[PDB]
Amino acid sequence: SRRWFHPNITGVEAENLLLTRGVDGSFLARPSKSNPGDFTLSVRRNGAVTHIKIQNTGDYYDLYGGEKFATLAELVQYYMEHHGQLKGDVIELKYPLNCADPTSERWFHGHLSGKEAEKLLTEKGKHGSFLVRESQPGDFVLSVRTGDSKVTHVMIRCQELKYDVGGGERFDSLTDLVEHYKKNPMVETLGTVLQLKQPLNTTRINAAEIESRVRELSKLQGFWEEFETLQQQECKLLYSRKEGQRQENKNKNRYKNILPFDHTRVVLHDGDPPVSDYINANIIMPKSYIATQGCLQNTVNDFWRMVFQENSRVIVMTTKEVERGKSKCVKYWPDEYALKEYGVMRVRNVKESAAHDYTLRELKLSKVGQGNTERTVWQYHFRTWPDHGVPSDPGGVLDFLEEVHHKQESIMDAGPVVVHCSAGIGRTGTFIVIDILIDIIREKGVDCDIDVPKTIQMVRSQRSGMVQTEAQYRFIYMAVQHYIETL
């Protein structure tokens, strides 16, 4: 349930909603109208409404007078289970004020004719594939596919702000109606059970026709709607992050609330003979990756223990050490030609090679007191990503990725590619998803199916909030487009 997020409301609409339909402790979140890319958390307290700014430049959600989070749902879950934390006065998030607007649902298709929706369910649908469109006069149509085959249309009437299928219950939202008939399916007179198994997949595109999709997603934007429908699916990804919350592990996190999932975290087995198994890092399985945060002075040894145990031969750094006067990642590698020890691990910097968009460092890693453990580790340091937003052209990112890929393909039995930035979720997620998408187009060529949100969602179940902003989302499409056009 992420119903507390209203995508199409102004600050004034939000104020009236919380005053007339809410109580003290009532809250909602919404996208900013005065500055796109920002969010507002509106809370009712002592009869008055407080508007709290949330910012996302692409690394994390930064709440004003609060903490840094991987997702809006992780933010809201934290403040609803940690009172007295949001402020002089304490602001309590007690009651989420639900949104009835169906615009961010995977099944809602707004304007769509009966023939067009039937063409979509006939060409793309399967058993249980459904969608909801606007009639065809203020009413709605639920269109479902059944078989292994036919298409049924269930009329949905909007009467006095309530929704119904002809008889029975009247629902406050189309969502409450859809969720009801998902659990208890409508049975036709002659035995057909109208199972609402999955929403109709319309995001899956053929690689060769990316330029067509990008053109449409750019029309009044379509990119904003597809991304917001993906954000609404983040409430299904609140997996436990217990290990990261342990007292002994707290100072091993760059941002106390951006934690690895327990089910995919990297477990370190080197073990200095109390709590030596932790790193803020996750395994990302589509060639594998490891997504991690930028080192802290106290986590550099753990970082090399990870690289060594995982047999990784390639590291992708997507940040400068220092950005906007803030430490983003500590320097975990020696100076060129220098040799250094990071606990039981030894690193030599053999050669540094500068290119326009990046530096390549040839590092040799080994365990101290064991010469035959030596292996070359290639460090790809991308240096030209802007402090805010994304590069305006994907060429540089694409050339860099093409080079990282060839290095990784040339090494036999290379472990996962290590990818990091600051919190290890924004730029990191962006690099991994482009890399996953372009890998499909490598083996299967131009005549293959690519599904950007399905890929992001799959990467997000392995690490919280991978791909942070709408701009990164649009950058993923632009990069895939450029790759297919330069083939």
Ligand SMILES: Cn1c(N2CCC(C)(N)CC2)nc2[nH]nc(-c3cccc(Cl)c3Cl)c2c1=O
């Ligand atoms: C159909 N669909 C739309 N649509 C439909 C209706 C529309 C015209 N209103 C806008 C675009 N957007 C989306 N974004 N993400 C997804 C998505 C895809 C696969 C897995 C997961 Cl988990 C997600 Cl979330 C998704 C989606 O399925």
